[PDB]
Every structure is written in structure tokens, then in C-alpha cells.
């Protein structure tokens, strides 16, 4: 369905709200969700837990089967699997974690994987306790991402923050 609504349209492709994720996820009901994943999938905090536990922790099962069989993923790369009761898939990204010391770099790899989808739904990556500069995170996202990316950011003063500086 892709029934976006309530965005900021920053660029002819990018768009951005101040939302829970998952509650975008339920109404919007779009083909892609874009989960902040970790390279071996466990789904505890931020993003990620509040997307399993909206599954009814459907998400953790069917990503330790595909981490059992596959191995981790690598930072900046991504996995589709089902997107369950929010979703028709969930792209799992993982962006580095700068608090942990990965690199910075990555954060443009972890982006150039929205572009094998038309439209997704997604968190601002690498931001929160991965420590990335959030604005940063932003203009990387605008500079790498050419397919139609809705961001739901779940804290007011943030996304008042990205929206006064993109302005600029
Ligand atoms: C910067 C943050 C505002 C952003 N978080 C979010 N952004 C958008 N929809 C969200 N829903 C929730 C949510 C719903 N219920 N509960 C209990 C939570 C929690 N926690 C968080 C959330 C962010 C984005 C990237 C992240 C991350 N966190 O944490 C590390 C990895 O990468």
C-alpha cells in the first residue's frame, strides 16, 4: 500500500517524521521496513527490539534460524527476510557502530543498500547509542539513497534538530 502520510519532503526522494517506527509500520503497512540491525540479528534495544516484540517476537525466531545456516552479516551489509504482521519484508541493515569504534565510513555501504528497493520505510542508521552525528547520518542518506526513503525518527528534539540544520 505505501500510504505514507505526514511526512517533511526534504529532497525529490527523501521524506521525514517525528514517529515510532513500528507504529508507522501498522498503518502504513509498507513492502519494506528497515530494521537497525547488529551483525548476528539479535533484536534487543532500540529499533530492533520494538520491531520483534511488535512481531511477537516472530523476527528473533526466523533470524537465529538464518544466522544458524548463514553466519553474521558484515557491517555496512544487509538481509531480507519476512517482514511478518509490519511488513511485506524486513531489510535488515546494519550501520557501524561508532560508540564501539567501527568505522564511519561504512555508514554510505549501509545506505547504498535501500537502493535494490522503490520505497522503504527506515531509522535513521548509525544514530541513538550507535553514536553517530545524526546530521551526518542525514546528509549521507541523502547523498547515497536515489530510491524513496520515509524516515520516522522517535524523538522530537532530534528530528527538530535534523530538520533546523537541512534547512540551512
Ligand atoms: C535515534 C533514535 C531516536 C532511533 N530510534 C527509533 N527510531 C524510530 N522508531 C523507533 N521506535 C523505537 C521504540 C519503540 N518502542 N520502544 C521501546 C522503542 C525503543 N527503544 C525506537 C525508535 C534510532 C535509530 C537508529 C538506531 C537506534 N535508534 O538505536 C541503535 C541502533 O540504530
Redesign the pocket.
Given at each position: 500500500v505505501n500510504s505514507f502520510s505526514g511526512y517533511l519532503k526534504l529532497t525529490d526522494n527523501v521524506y521525514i517524521k517525528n514517529?515510532?517506527?513500528?507504529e508507522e509500520a501498522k498503518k502504513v503497512k509498507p513492502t519494506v521496513v528497515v530494521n537497525?540491525a547488529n551483525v548476528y540479528l539479535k533484536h534487543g534495544?532500540?529499533?530492533?527490539?520494538?520491531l520483534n516484540?511488535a512481531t511477537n517476537n516472530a523476527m528473533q525466531v526466523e533470524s537465529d534460524d538464518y544466522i544458524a545456516t548463514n553466519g553474521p552479516l558484515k557491517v555496512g551489509g544487509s538481509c531480507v527476510l519476512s517482514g511478518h504482521n509490519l511488513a511485506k519484508h524486513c531489510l535488515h541493515v546494519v550501520?557501524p557502530?561508532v560508540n564501539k569504534g567501527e568505522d564511519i565510513q561504512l555508514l554510505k555501504s549501509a545506505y547504498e543498500n535501500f537502493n535494490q528497493h522503490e520505497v522503504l520505510l527506515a531509522?535513521?542508521?548509525?544514530?541513538?547509542?550507535?553514536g553517530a552525528d545524526?546530521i551526518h547520518s542525514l546528509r549521507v542518506c541523502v547523498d547515497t539513497v536515489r530510491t524513496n526513503v520515509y524516515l520516522?525518527?522517535?524523538?522530537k528534539n532530534?528530528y527538530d534538530k535534523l530538520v533546523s540544520s537541512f534547512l540551512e
Open positions: 514517529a515510532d517506527i513500528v537497525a534495544g532500540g529499533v530492533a527490539g520494538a516484540k550501520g557502530n531509522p535513521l542508521l548509525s544514530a541513538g547509542i550507535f545524526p520516522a525518527v522517535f524523538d532530534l
